[model samples]
Target: AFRQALQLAASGLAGGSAAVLFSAVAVGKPRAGGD
Candidate 1:
Protein backbone atom coordinates (compact mmCIF):
# COMPACT_ATOMS: atom_id res chain seq x y z
CA ALA A 1 0.00 0.00 0.00
CA PHE A 2 2.70 2.45 0.94
CA ARG A 3 4.75 1.68 -2.15
CA GLN A 4 1.72 1.96 -4.38
CA ALA A 5 0.93 5.37 -2.98
CA LEU A 6 4.42 6.60 -3.69
CA GLN A 7 4.29 5.32 -7.28
CA LEU A 8 0.92 6.89 -7.83
CA ALA A 9 2.15 10.22 -6.59
CA ALA A 10 5.14 10.07 -8.88
CA SER A 11 2.99 9.30 -11.87
CA GLY A 12 0.63 12.15 -11.08
CA LEU A 13 3.51 14.56 -10.74
CA ALA A 14 5.01 13.47 -14.00
CA GLY A 15 1.74 13.76 -15.87
CA GLY A 16 0.90 17.13 -14.38
CA SER A 17 4.32 18.49 -15.23
CA ALA A 18 4.08 17.25 -18.78
CA ALA A 19 0.64 18.75 -19.14
CA VAL A 20 1.83 22.12 -17.96
CA LEU A 21 4.83 22.02 -20.24
CA PHE A 22 2.81 21.06 -23.30
CA SER A 23 0.14 23.68 -22.63
CA ALA A 24 2.70 26.37 -22.14
CA VAL A 25 4.20 25.65 -25.52
CA ALA A 26 0.81 25.35 -27.13
CA VAL A 27 -1.01 28.36 -25.63
CA GLY A 28 1.36 30.65 -23.78
CA LYS A 29 4.07 31.02 -26.42
CA PRO A 30 4.29 30.72 -30.15
CA ARG A 31 6.82 28.54 -31.85
CA ALA A 32 9.31 29.71 -34.45
CA GLY A 33 9.12 27.98 -37.84
CA GLY A 34 7.07 25.20 -36.38
CA ASP A 35 4.45 22.94 -37.85
Candidate 2:
Protein backbone atom coordinates (compact mmCIF):
# COMPACT_ATOMS: atom_id res chain seq x y z
CA ALA A 1 0.00 0.00 0.00
CA PHE A 2 2.70 2.51 0.93
CA ARG A 3 4.82 1.64 -2.06
CA GLN A 4 1.83 1.86 -4.36
CA ALA A 5 0.91 5.28 -3.02
CA LEU A 6 4.45 6.52 -3.50
CA GLN A 7 4.47 5.12 -7.01
CA LEU A 8 1.20 6.79 -7.91
CA ALA A 9 2.36 10.18 -6.66
CA ALA A 10 5.77 9.94 -8.31
CA SER A 11 4.39 8.74 -11.65
CA GLY A 12 2.35 11.84 -12.36
CA LEU A 13 4.67 14.25 -10.55
CA ALA A 14 7.74 13.37 -12.60
CA GLY A 15 5.77 13.23 -15.82
CA GLY A 16 4.13 16.58 -15.23
CA SER A 17 7.27 18.27 -13.94
CA ALA A 18 9.50 16.88 -16.67
CA ALA A 19 7.04 17.79 -19.36
CA VAL A 20 6.80 21.33 -18.05
CA LEU A 21 10.57 21.71 -17.75
CA PHE A 22 11.14 20.20 -21.16
CA SER A 23 8.69 22.55 -22.82
CA ALA A 24 10.11 25.55 -21.01
CA VAL A 25 13.66 24.63 -21.98
CA ALA A 26 13.14 23.10 -25.46
CA VAL A 27 9.96 24.74 -26.78
CA GLY A 28 10.46 28.12 -25.20
CA LYS A 29 9.00 31.60 -25.70
CA PRO A 30 8.41 33.58 -28.89
CA ARG A 31 11.13 35.61 -30.53
CA ALA A 32 11.19 39.41 -30.38
CA GLY A 33 12.12 39.57 -34.06
CA GLY A 34 9.32 38.72 -36.42
CA ASP A 35 9.42 36.13 -39.21
Candidate 3:
Protein backbone atom coordinates (compact mmCIF):
# COMPACT_ATOMS: atom_id res chain seq x y z
CA ALA A 1 0.00 0.00 0.00
CA PHE A 2 2.71 2.47 0.99
CA ARG A 3 4.85 1.82 -2.04
CA GLN A 4 1.94 2.19 -4.43
CA ALA A 5 0.85 5.45 -2.85
CA LEU A 6 4.39 6.76 -2.98
CA GLN A 7 4.71 6.01 -6.65
CA LEU A 8 1.50 7.82 -7.47
CA ALA A 9 2.53 10.90 -5.51
CA ALA A 10 5.99 10.96 -7.06
CA SER A 11 4.68 10.81 -10.60
CA GLY A 12 2.10 13.52 -9.95
CA LEU A 13 4.71 15.82 -8.48
CA ALA A 14 7.07 15.25 -11.38
CA GLY A 15 4.38 16.00 -13.95
CA GLY A 16 3.29 19.17 -12.17
CA SER A 17 6.83 20.48 -11.99
CA ALA A 18 7.41 19.74 -15.65
CA ALA A 19 4.28 21.64 -16.60
CA VAL A 20 5.24 24.62 -14.47
CA LEU A 21 8.69 24.82 -16.03
CA PHE A 22 7.22 24.50 -19.52
CA SER A 23 4.72 27.30 -18.84
CA ALA A 24 7.50 29.54 -17.58
CA VAL A 25 9.53 29.03 -20.71
CA ALA A 26 6.55 29.67 -22.95
CA VAL A 27 5.60 32.82 -21.11
CA GLY A 28 9.20 33.97 -20.95
CA LYS A 29 10.03 33.16 -24.53
CA PRO A 30 10.45 36.79 -25.55
CA ARG A 31 12.93 37.56 -22.77
CA ALA A 32 14.84 34.40 -23.43
CA GLY A 33 15.16 35.00 -27.15
CA GLY A 34 16.00 38.72 -26.75
CA ASP A 35 13.36 41.28 -25.91
Candidate 4:
Protein backbone atom coordinates (compact mmCIF):
# COMPACT_ATOMS: atom_id res chain seq x y z
CA ALA A 1 0.00 0.00 0.00
CA PHE A 2 2.82 2.39 0.75
CA ARG A 3 4.40 1.95 -2.66
CA GLN A 4 1.10 2.39 -4.40
CA ALA A 5 0.58 5.67 -2.61
CA LEU A 6 4.07 6.86 -3.42
CA GLN A 7 3.73 5.93 -7.08
CA LEU A 8 0.41 7.73 -7.36
CA ALA A 9 1.86 10.90 -5.89
CA ALA A 10 4.96 10.74 -8.06
CA SER A 11 2.92 10.22 -11.20
CA GLY A 12 0.60 13.09 -10.37
CA LEU A 13 3.43 15.56 -9.85
CA ALA A 14 5.48 14.33 -12.79
CA GLY A 15 2.61 14.44 -15.21
CA GLY A 16 1.58 17.91 -14.16
CA SER A 17 5.10 19.31 -14.31
CA ALA A 18 5.88 17.63 -17.59
CA ALA A 19 2.74 18.94 -19.16
CA VAL A 20 3.60 22.50 -18.25
CA LEU A 21 7.19 22.25 -19.46
CA PHE A 22 6.22 20.52 -22.71
CA SER A 23 3.52 23.04 -23.39
CA ALA A 24 5.98 25.90 -23.17
CA VAL A 25 7.64 24.64 -26.36
CA ALA A 26 4.59 22.98 -27.90
CA VAL A 27 2.50 26.12 -28.12
CA GLY A 28 2.62 27.93 -31.47
CA LYS A 29 4.77 31.03 -31.08
CA PRO A 30 6.63 31.87 -34.29
CA ARG A 31 8.13 30.48 -37.49
CA ALA A 32 11.50 28.72 -37.57
CA GLY A 33 12.72 31.12 -40.35
CA GLY A 34 13.29 28.21 -42.67
CA ASP A 35 14.12 28.53 -46.33
Candidate 5:
Protein backbone atom coordinates (compact mmCIF):
# COMPACT_ATOMS: atom_id res chain seq x y z
CA ALA A 1 0.00 0.00 0.00
CA PHE A 2 2.76 2.42 0.74
CA ARG A 3 4.49 1.68 -2.55
CA GLN A 4 1.27 2.20 -4.46
CA ALA A 5 0.70 5.50 -2.71
CA LEU A 6 4.20 6.66 -3.49
CA GLN A 7 3.80 5.72 -7.13
CA LEU A 8 0.61 7.71 -7.42
CA ALA A 9 2.17 10.75 -5.78
CA ALA A 10 5.19 10.59 -8.04
CA SER A 11 3.03 10.45 -11.13
CA GLY A 12 1.02 13.43 -9.98
CA LEU A 13 4.14 15.46 -9.33
CA ALA A 14 5.61 14.67 -12.73
CA GLY A 15 2.39 15.66 -14.50
CA GLY A 16 2.08 18.86 -12.47
CA SER A 17 5.67 19.83 -13.26
CA ALA A 18 5.13 19.34 -16.96
CA ALA A 19 2.00 21.45 -16.88
CA VAL A 20 3.72 24.23 -14.96
CA LEU A 21 6.61 24.29 -17.42
CA PHE A 22 4.31 24.40 -20.43
CA SER A 23 2.26 27.19 -18.89
CA ALA A 24 5.36 29.21 -18.03
CA VAL A 25 6.60 29.00 -21.59
CA ALA A 26 3.22 29.90 -23.03
CA VAL A 27 2.87 32.90 -20.74
CA GLY A 28 6.44 34.06 -21.17
CA LYS A 29 6.61 33.93 -24.95
CA PRO A 30 5.04 37.33 -25.66
CA ARG A 31 7.05 39.07 -22.95
CA ALA A 32 10.28 37.55 -24.14
CA GLY A 33 9.46 38.25 -27.75
CA GLY A 34 8.73 41.88 -27.03
CA ASP A 35 12.03 42.37 -25.25
Candidate 6:
Protein backbone atom coordinates (compact mmCIF):
# COMPACT_ATOMS: atom_id res chain seq x y z
CA ALA A 1 0.00 0.00 0.00
CA PHE A 2 2.83 2.38 0.78
CA ARG A 3 4.49 1.63 -2.56
CA GLN A 4 1.26 2.20 -4.38
CA ALA A 5 0.79 5.51 -2.62
CA LEU A 6 4.26 6.60 -3.61
CA GLN A 7 3.61 5.67 -7.22
CA LEU A 8 0.44 7.67 -7.24
CA ALA A 9 2.19 10.70 -5.80
CA ALA A 10 4.94 10.49 -8.38
CA SER A 11 2.47 10.24 -11.20
CA GLY A 12 0.56 13.21 -9.87
CA LEU A 13 3.69 15.31 -9.72
CA ALA A 14 4.62 14.35 -13.26
CA GLY A 15 1.16 15.21 -14.50
CA GLY A 16 1.23 18.54 -12.71
CA SER A 17 4.57 19.39 -14.23
CA ALA A 18 3.37 18.52 -17.69
CA ALA A 19 0.30 20.66 -17.19
CA VAL A 20 2.39 23.60 -16.08
CA LEU A 21 4.67 23.24 -19.07
CA PHE A 22 1.75 23.01 -21.45
CA SER A 23 0.07 26.06 -19.92
CA ALA A 24 3.27 28.06 -20.19
CA VAL A 25 3.60 27.26 -23.85
CA ALA A 26 -0.03 27.91 -24.56
CA VAL A 27 0.04 31.28 -22.86
CA GLY A 28 3.45 32.24 -24.17
CA LYS A 29 2.43 31.93 -27.79
CA PRO A 30 -0.46 34.34 -27.45
CA ARG A 31 1.51 36.79 -25.36
CA ALA A 32 4.35 36.73 -27.87
CA GLY A 33 2.00 37.52 -30.70
CA GLY A 34 0.25 40.26 -28.75
CA ASP A 35 3.58 41.91 -27.98
- Give lDDT per model, in order: 0.77, 0.76, 0.77, 0.77, 0.77, 0.75
lDDT of candidate model 6 versus the reference: 0.75
Each candidate: RMSD: 6.0, 5.2, 5.2, 4.8, 5.3, 5.8
- For model 4, residues 1-35, the per-residue Cα lDDT tens digits are 99899989987767556677777886956777953
What candidate 2 gets wrong by more than 4 Å, as runs, is: 15-35
lDDT of 1 at 8: 93
RMSD of 4: 4.8
Q: What is the TM-score of each candidate against the true structure?
A: 0.36, 0.34, 0.37, 0.36, 0.37, 0.36
Runs of candidate 1 exceeding 4 Å displacement: 15-35
- Mind giving the per-residue lDDT tens digits that candidate 1 earns over 1-35? 99999999987867556777877776876656695
lDDT of 4 at 26: 68
True lDDT of residue 24, candidate 2: 90
TM-score of 1: 0.36
Alpha-carbon error at 16 in model 3, in Å? Answer: 10
lDDT of 5 by residue, 1-35 (tens): 99999999987867656778888976766654565
